[PDB]
Amino acid sequence: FRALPGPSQRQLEVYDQCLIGAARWPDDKSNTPENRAYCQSMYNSIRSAGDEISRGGITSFEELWGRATEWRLSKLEPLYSAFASERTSDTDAVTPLVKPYKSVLARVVDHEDAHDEIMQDNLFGDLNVKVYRQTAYLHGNVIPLNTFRVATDTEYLRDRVAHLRTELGAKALKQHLQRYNPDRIDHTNASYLPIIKDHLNDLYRQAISSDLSQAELISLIARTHWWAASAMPDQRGSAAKAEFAARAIASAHGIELPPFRNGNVSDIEAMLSGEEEFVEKYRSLLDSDCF
Amino acid sequence: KFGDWDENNPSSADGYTHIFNKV
């Protein structure tokens, strides 16, 4: 193809490098030694991958996702397999909305696109819930992605959770709450990963062309970020990988993306919006202020 | 209180993405 500019000589200030890939929950780690280092490591590996991208050394999004995974893996451990494996279609992916995701609860309850449904549970019964349903549109067809659930009948919950503990046992209850916690995220069905990965490859292929306005480039990057994160392709570490890939693509063009603002967790911000919506706000999620 | 219903719950769910076999 045609070599790109590659990472810029003018680098981010060190305190920003140390915030790359951080998870700055508005309700809370990013200041710790190990996280600063982890973030500076990500910033550096992104530039390394960027150099390669600019030279035509990484020809597929899958290849780039592979580089991101290798990096994240070197930062690890029995959970190794989870961070290294893709999600298989014979499974479901669920993230309970518990620490450190508490800030998400409110984001779902007060979301403009949220609605009230009834969530039947063979233990708690039918529960009233605020529901946000992330969907995407590819090739003319809707494809449901992540679904957020937050139960409102709190009182009933705390009391009922109690009786169950003693009736079924903590062990069994936890086994159940781990998958069907009243407040949780049911992630994009693994069955869509094949079609989505192919799409990510087309976005990548386009973001690798040397003739694009900066604006177009940023939007392409925000899109790629949205798809990669919302799809949550791997069993573990998808957010980290999605951000790595986005930044790398940017770095390959000489763009030095700043860290995400405090309070803005990129993957969560993505799962809470539609594609265009996220693309239009992407810039504002990034801390690009001088002072 | 939207998630404080499981106060001091010994069986609380762990805060991260878990995978399960499709039923």
Residue numbers in the entry:
A (entry chain A): 26 to 53, 56 to 103, 107 to 321
B (entry chain C): 150 to 172
Any passages from the paper?
The structure of AvrB complexed to RIN4142–176 revealed that the peptide forms a “Z” shape with the N-terminal half contacting the upper lobe and the C-terminal half straddling the interface between the two lobes. The interaction of AvrB with RIN4142–176 does not alter the overall structure of AvrB (unpublished data). The N-terminal half of RIN4142–176 interacts mainly through hydrophobic burial of RIN4 W154 plus a hydrogen bond between the indole nitrogen of RIN4 W154 and AvrB D213. The most extensive interactions of RIN4142–176 with AvrB involve the C-terminal half of the RIN4 peptide. First, there is a set of antiparallel beta-strand hydrogen-bonding interactions between main-chain AvrB residues 120 to 124 (within strand β1) and RIN4 residues 167–171. Second, there is a hydrogen bond between the main-chain of RIN4 N170 and the AvrB R209 guanidinium group. These interactions allow this region of RIN4 to form an additional strand of the beta-sheet in the upper lobe of AvrB. Importantly, in forming this strand, the RIN4 T166 side-chain is directed toward the interior of AvrB such that the hydroxyl group hydrogen bonds with the hydroxyl group of AvrB T125, which in turn hydrogen bonds to the imidazole ring of AvrB H217. Above this hydrogen-bonding arrangement, the aromatic rings of RIN4 Y165 and F169 as well as interleaving H167 are thrust against the surface formed from the last two turns of AvrB helix α7. The guanidinium groups of AvrB R209 and AvrB R266 buttress the termini of the ring-stack, contacting RIN4 F169 and Y165, respectively, via π–π interactions such that the guanidium groups are also almost parallel to the three stacked aromatic rings of RIN4.
